[PDB]
Design a protein around this ligand. Sequence first.
Ligand SMILES: [Hg+2]
Ligand SMILES: [Hg+2]
Lengths: 260, 249
Amino acid sequence: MLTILKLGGSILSDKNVPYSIKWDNLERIAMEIKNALDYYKNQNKEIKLILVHGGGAFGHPVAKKYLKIEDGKKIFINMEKGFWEIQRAMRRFNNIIIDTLQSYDIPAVSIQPSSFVVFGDKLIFDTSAIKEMLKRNLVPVIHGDIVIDDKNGYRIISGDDIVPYLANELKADLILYATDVDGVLIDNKPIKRIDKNNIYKILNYLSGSNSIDVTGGMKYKIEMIRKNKCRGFVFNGNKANNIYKALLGEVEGTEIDFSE
Amino acid sequence: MLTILKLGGSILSDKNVPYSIKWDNLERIAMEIKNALDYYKNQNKEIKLILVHGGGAFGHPVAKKYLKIEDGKKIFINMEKGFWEIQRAMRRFNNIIIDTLQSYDIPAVSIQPSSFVVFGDKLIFDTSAIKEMLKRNLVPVIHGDIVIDDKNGYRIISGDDIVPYLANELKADLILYATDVDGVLIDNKPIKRIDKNNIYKILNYLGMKYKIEMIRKNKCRGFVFNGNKANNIYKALLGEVEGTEIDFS
Ligand SMILES: [Hg+2]
Ligand SMILES: [Hg+2]
């Protein structure tokens, strides 16, 4: 039973406030994760868990200084300074999250993409260590990070890039997207379920002018779950117990199911 | 083309003092490395450089808490806490070193083994990222770290493990070992060179062993010199011989 939980939205950090940390939320989230891990142990049910988080007010604020738009394209500059500066900011955010998780006795450990991942048409991302960590009951905590590509450039790898890749690569049984909203909003209300019988209808809706989310973020999550034939929930990570419940397999928000 | 400089734990920290940093040495070292890189580009000569450092006085203090004796071997315990605590200690040391290097405009970046390296039947160490970084003229800084061991569960990979592996894996032209001694000491005296000739007698007399061993198993070529002596590191990066030379072809 492998579950990958993405702590997204702005539940851990306010992107507006530089280097801000939502301490209270982070601690509650840690509490719920611990509560869930304890539940599984008592129910004698095995559970492998991978946590993924973005840069929050740590990554983007730093990366922006090294980002430029040239010929209508994103390009990283002055990276002889920028690669490290971004790595440094992410490392700090990851330290804080892992330290907090460990304070509730969650066996979290650090996975830093910038050290070994290469952004190509097909990511070079060795999961050997991660597999071994999960075998020994550790909880790998992977974060969005700056990474080099295979074309003389760089790229910010995000949680949205990381979750699908690992979901497929490790054959996760469940994907959990903790966000700032209640689910995939159709008429300002989370649609209970998205599957092979309504996905296109939902994606076209999301592409419409009546869509609460026009960022295409939900569309991408849905598309990747279909692609890798996974099952996942998109829910509000800000609501007490949602994370605990989602980790127990209880549908929260919107269920996206394409598992075979 | 590619040189791999190893900074001995002894010259960056004090093993006798947990969480110790030899600030002046570190800064001198960074400065010398900076001057060397400037020398090459001034000659318009392209030089790829990878830096490696051990856990110094950060690993042991913490790792010791998670290392026990089953009878005569090393046993890792409570790694649900220990893996992160050791990672954290190593990350702290690495940050300090890279921040110092960056303060001298050395384009250093962090390579954390714990996140992707696996010990055991054949080292699993993906170098794709490092290769790309070297093409950007970035200076990867790799460090000793706790890593998963598919056989023994856990293992503290050291600079002596990393350097040769990368030396071979990246076809490095020069291997440099900056340490606190004038070279490999035999009867308290630094030997000028170690070849296929005196190697036999040197191996019986004999960490330099485990070190001279793998540099042998990879037909590498390197110099073991004193990193505490002003300008040795600078001179060594310019291809100059310093201390004990081990040119195994
Ligand atoms: Hg899947
Ligand atoms: Hg070699």
